[PDB]
Amino acid sequence: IATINPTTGEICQRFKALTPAEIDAKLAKAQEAFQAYRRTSFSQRRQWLENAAAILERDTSKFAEIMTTEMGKTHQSAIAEAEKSALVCRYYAEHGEQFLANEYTETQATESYVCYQPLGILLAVMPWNFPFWQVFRFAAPALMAGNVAVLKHASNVPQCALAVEAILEAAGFPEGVFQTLLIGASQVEQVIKDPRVKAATLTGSEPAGASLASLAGQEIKPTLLELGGSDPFVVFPSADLDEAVEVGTVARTMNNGQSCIAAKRFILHEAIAAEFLEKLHLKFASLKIGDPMAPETDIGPLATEGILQDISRQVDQAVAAGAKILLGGRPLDRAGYFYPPTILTEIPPGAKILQEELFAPVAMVFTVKDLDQAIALANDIPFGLGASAWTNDPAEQQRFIQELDAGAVFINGMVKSDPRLPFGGTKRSGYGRELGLAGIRTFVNAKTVWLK
Amino acid sequence: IATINPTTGEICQRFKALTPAEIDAKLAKAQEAFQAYRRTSFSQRRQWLENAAAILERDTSKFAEIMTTEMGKTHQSAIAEAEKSALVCRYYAEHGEQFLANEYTETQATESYVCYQPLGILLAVMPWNFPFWQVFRFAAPALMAGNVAVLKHASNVPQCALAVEAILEAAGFPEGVFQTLLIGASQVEQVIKDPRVKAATLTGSEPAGASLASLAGQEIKPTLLELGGSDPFVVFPSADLDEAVEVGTVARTMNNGQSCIAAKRFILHEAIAAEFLEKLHLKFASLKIGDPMAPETDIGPLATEGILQDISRQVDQAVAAGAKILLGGRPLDRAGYFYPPTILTEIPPGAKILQEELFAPVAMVFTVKDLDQAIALANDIPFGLGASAWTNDPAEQQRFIQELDAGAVFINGMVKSDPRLPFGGTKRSGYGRELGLAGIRTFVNAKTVWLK
Fold first, then answer.
1. Contacts of B52 by beta carbon, 8 Å cutoff, 6+ apart
2. How far apart are CA B395 and CA B236, in angstroms?
3. What span, in angstroms and rounded, lies between the C-alpha atoms of B165 and B171?
4. Do residues A86 and A168 touch, judged by C-beta distance below 8 A?
5. Which parts of B147-213 are beta strand (E)?
6. Residues B324, B326, B329, B333: is their CA dihedral positive or negative?
7. CB 3.0-4.6 Å disulfide test: which of B107, B259, B352, B431 passes with A222?
8. In this structure, what is the dihedral angle of CA atoms A438, A441, A447, A451, given to the nearest 10 degrees?
C-alpha cells in the first residue's frame, strides 16, 4: 500500500497494512455502530449525506489533486469526479426515503406490505480508476439505507481511501458507520468470512470479482459485481459523423482510457468508415499528452507500471499477429507511465486481443456491411457492459436498443453513468445494478409483512 | 436417481442419469430455443402459461399422487400444492408483462428508460419437499420473462421432475424452453460452468446452496438462494390462544414438518405458556399418522431414510444433553420412514440443536418473560427466513415487525408464501426474492436506454 505518483514514478508515501486483529476490531466496531445506526431517522442520514456533498462541492480541487497525484487522471476530470460524487450523495439524500417506503399489496390481510430494512455490514472492494466516484456511488445509498460499510480500496489509492472516510466523519456520520481498511487483496477473505459481514460489492477486474463472489457464495452472502467491458461504439450512415467522432474520442480517451464503459471497439458501417476513421485518427493525433495537473492536458500517464506493461504487450502481440498501427502503439520515452492514444485496424480474425479489455487509450477499429453484422460483431465478446450506436433511422435505433447485449445502450451519445438511472453489466461484465432505485434496493432486506 | 416410496421403503423405478455429453446436448438445444423464444410475444407466453395452469387444475389428483408416492406428503396437501402451482402460473400470466414494462425517467435525453430483457438459460436446482410448487414458483416468471430453464430436481423425485416438463410441453411451450435434467448433485458443476448458462437459482439446504453459489461466483453469474430456517412462533399474553395453538400445530406439522417456513421454535410468554403448551401437547397427540394417500392422514412418513436418521440423531443428542421429551421423540416401529410429532422442552443453553433446522415435525419450546427477551431469542439463530408472532397489542406488533430478523414477519397468522408478495430469506437462509414483482425481475437484464 503506497502512493506512487504515476507522472514521475516517485514513491511518495508508504502505509502499514492492518493486521487481522485490527481488521477484526474494525468489524466489531462496525457491528456496534450498525446496532445504533439502523435506528437513526432518514432525517439524520440525509443531513450527514448532504453535509458530505457540501464538503465535496467546497473542496473539489483539493480532492482532485489527491486523485491526480495517486492515479494520474487529469486534475480537471478529477474535479468533475468530485462533483459527480457530491451529486450521487444528493441523489440518495433526496430520494432514498421514498425509494425505501413501504409498498402495500391487497390480500386478505388487514395489512400486507413489503418494507425495506438494512442488512448490516457491507464490504465494498473498489478500484483505482474512479477512486472517489465508485466509492460514493456505493456509499451514499448504503448509508441512506441504514447499512454500515467497510471499504477495501485499491492499494495504490490509499490517500483517496482515507480522504473518503475523513469526508464522511466531517459530515457527521457516527464512528464505525464507514471505515476504510488499509488492506491488501489477500486480506479480503477474512472480511467476507466474518459472520458480521452480510454482503459484498466489487467494482474492478474479473480475477478479483471471481474471488470475492466465489468466497461470498460459499458463505451464503449476496453480491454485486461491476467488472470490465469492451463496449462497442457503432456508427452507421445516417449518423452525425462529426459529433460521433468528437464524442467517440472522449469516450475512448477519458480517464486516460481507464474506464469499464470506455468506447473500446469502433464498429463502422463501410459507407462512412473511411471518413469516420480519418476524422478519428485526426482527433486522437492532436490530444495533449502531459502532466495531468495542467488544465490543458487531455492524456496523463496510465495509473501503474503494470497497466503500462500490460497494454504494451497486448498491442505488441496484436501487431505481431498482423494488426496495423494507424497511430501510437508504443510507450512514450519519458518519465511516468505514459502510453499514447493508439488506433489499431485490420486486426486478424482469432487474435486474442479481440476478446480482451484494453484499459488504456487504444481503439480497435472494424468495418461492417450491414446492421446484422454490426450487432453480431458488437456482441461477439465475453463482456456486456455498455454499448453506443449512432444512427438516425428509427428502425435501426430500435434494433440496436433491443439486440445489443449490454446493460446499457446509448443512441447518439456516449455511455455515461447518471445517478438517475440504474447502471450495471451483463455476461462477464457482472450482475446487479447500482444507481437509481436499484442502487438502494440491492443490499436491503425486503421484508414481507402480513398482519391479520 | 429413483422413486423409492417412503411409506413402504420399496424401490419403484430407477432412472439412468444423463451423461455429460447428453447434458451438453440439452444446453445446446436450450440455447437454440432461447434465440427464438426471446422473440415470442407476451401473448404467446401467457397462453402457454395459462394452458399449464389449466392442466394443473384439471389433473390435481393425479399429479398429487405422484408427489405422495415419491416423497410422502399427504395426498390432500399435494392437491393443494398442485393448485398453488396453477395459481403462480396464472399470477405471472396476469401480471408479468406489466411487471416488465419500460420504466421512464426524465433526463436531457429525448427518451431515457429501463427495459427488461431475458438473460438466457437459467439453471434451477430444486428440492424434494415441494416438488411441484418450488418448480412452478421459479418457472412461471422465468418463462414469462423470456428466459429458458434447465431443472436439476432432487434425485428422489424424478417422476415429479419429468411430470413438470410434460405439463409444460402439453401446454405448448416450445422444445428446449424447459428441460428436466435427470442428473445428480455431482453433475451440477458442469451446468454452472457452461458458457451458455447465465444464472442459477437454488432452493434447498446450505451445503448444496454454498456449492452452487460459490461455483457461480467464480463464473461471474448471479444467483438466488432460498435455504432453511428455524422460524420462531412467538405467542404473547394478548393472543387468541386457541387460534395460535391450532395454527401453530399446522405450521409445525404441515408437509410432515419438512418446510423452510415451518414453525420450528415456539417462544411462549410465561403468562400463557402453561396453557398453550398443554393445548399444543394435546393437539399434536391427536394428529393422524399413516398412509399419506388416505384423506384423513395428517402425518405421512419423512421423505427419505437419511432425513429420518438425521432427526432421530438430533433429538437423541438433545435429550442426552438434558432436553425433555413432552411428546414423541423416537422413530415409529412400522414400515416406512415414520417419525412422530414431537415436542422438546427445557433444552439446555449451548445445546447444538438450538442452532439447527429440524426438518421433521419436531417443535422446540421456550419460555420468555418479556418482549425484549422474545425478540433476542427469536433472532439467536444462523437463519432468518420467516417469523410469526401472536399479539393484539399494536406496540408489540410494531416491534415484532420491525425487529424480528427475518425475510417475512406474520402477525396473528402462520407464515405462508403467496404469489402476490415477495418471498425470501436473510442471514444463512439465503438472499434474493421470489414471487411478486421481485420474482420476475431477478433474472432479467435491466437495460438502461438513453436516446438523444
1. B86, B89, B136, B140, B167, B168, B171, B173
2. 12
3. 10
4. no
5. 148-152, 178-180, 197-203
6. positive
7. B431
8. -70
Q: Are A315 and A344 in contact (CB under 8 A)?
A: yes
Burial B205-214 (b: 16+ CB within 10 A, else e): ebebbbbbbb
Q: Which whole-number Å values give the CA distances from A441 to A224, B222, B287, in the listed order? A: 12, 16, 43
In angstroms, the CA B95 to CA B360 distance is 36
User: How many CB atoms lie under 10 A from the CB of residue B37?
Assistant: 22
Nearest to A107 among B420, B423, B449 (CB): B420
Residue A52's CB is within 10 A of a number of other CB atoms, namely: 28
User: For residue A28, how far is the Cα from the chain centroid?
Assistant: 29
Cell of B388: 410469526
Phi, psi of A80 (to 5 degrees): -60, -40
- Report the run of H or E that residue B375 belongs to, with start and end: helix B371-379
Q: What chain A residue is nearest to B414 in terms of C-alpha separation? A: A450
For residues B44, B49, B50, B53, the Cα torsion angle rounded to the nearest 10 degrees is: 160
Told to judge if B275 belongs to the known catalytic residues of this protein, a careful annotator would answer no
DSSP A432: -
| Rounded CA separation A294/A284 (Å) | 19
DSSP A293: T
Percent of chain A that is helix, strand, coil (3-state, to 5): 45, 20, 35
Report the amino acid identity of residue B279: K
Q: Known binder of ligand: residue B137?
A: yes
CB B428 within 8 A of CB B382: yes
To 10 degrees, the CA torsion angle through B25, B28, B33, B36? -150
What does the alpha-carbon distance between residue A32 and residue B41 come to, in Å, rounded to a whole number? 52
Tally of CB atoms within 10 A around B113: 18
Does the beta-carbon distance from A408 to B449 stay under 8 Å? yes
User: 3-state SS of chain B: helix, strand, coil percent to 5?
Assistant: 45, 20, 35
Does the beta-carbon distance from A107 to B219 stay under 8 Å? no
**Can you list the pairs that A5-8 forms with residues at least 24 positions away whose Cβ atoms lie under 8 Å?**
A5/A69, A5/A70, A5/A72, A6/A71, A6/A72, A6/A300, A6/A301, A6/A302, A6/A303, A6/A304, A6/A336, A6/A337, A7/A72, A7/A291, A7/A292, A7/A293, A7/A300, A7/A301, A7/A335, A7/A336, A8/A335, A8/A336
Tell me which DSSP letter residue A434 carries. Answer: B
Chain B residues whose beta carbon lies within 8 Å of the beta carbon of residue A445:
407, 426
Q: Which residues of A120-135 are buried (b: 16+ CB within 10 A; e: fewer)?
A: bbbbbbbbbbbbbbbb
Residues 6+ apart with CB under 8 A from A229: A260, A261, A262, A264, A357, A383, A384, A385, A386, A406, A425, A429
Instruction: Yes or no: say if B362 and B340 are a contact pair by the CB < 8 Å rule.
Output: no
Q: What angle do CA B63, B68, B74 make, to 5 degrees?
A: 110
For A62, A142, B92, the CA distances from A100, given in Å and listed in that order, are 34, 12, 24
User: DSSP E strands: which ranges in B105-144?
Assistant: 111-118, 121-125
Among B220, B225, B446, select the one facing A430 at the smallest CB separation: B220
Answer yes or no: do A401 and B449 touch at CB < 8 A: yes
**Could you tell me which residues of A are annotated as the binding site for NADP(+)?**
126, 128, 137, 152, 155, 204-205, 226-227, 357
Alpha-carbon distance of A32 to B206, in angstroms, equals 28
A115 is catalytic: no
CB contact under 8 A, B410 and A227: no
Domains and CATH numbers, chain A: 1-228+419-452 (3.40.605.10), 229-418 (3.40.309.10)
Query: How many Cα atoms within 13 Å fall on the side-chain side of residue B36?
Result: 10
Q: What is the DSSP string of B388-411?
A: EEE---HHHHHHHHHH--SSEEEE
Nearest to A408 among B209, B223, B447 (CB): B447
Report the phi/psi class of residue A327: left, alpha or beta, with left for phi > 0 and alpha for psi in -120 to 50: beta
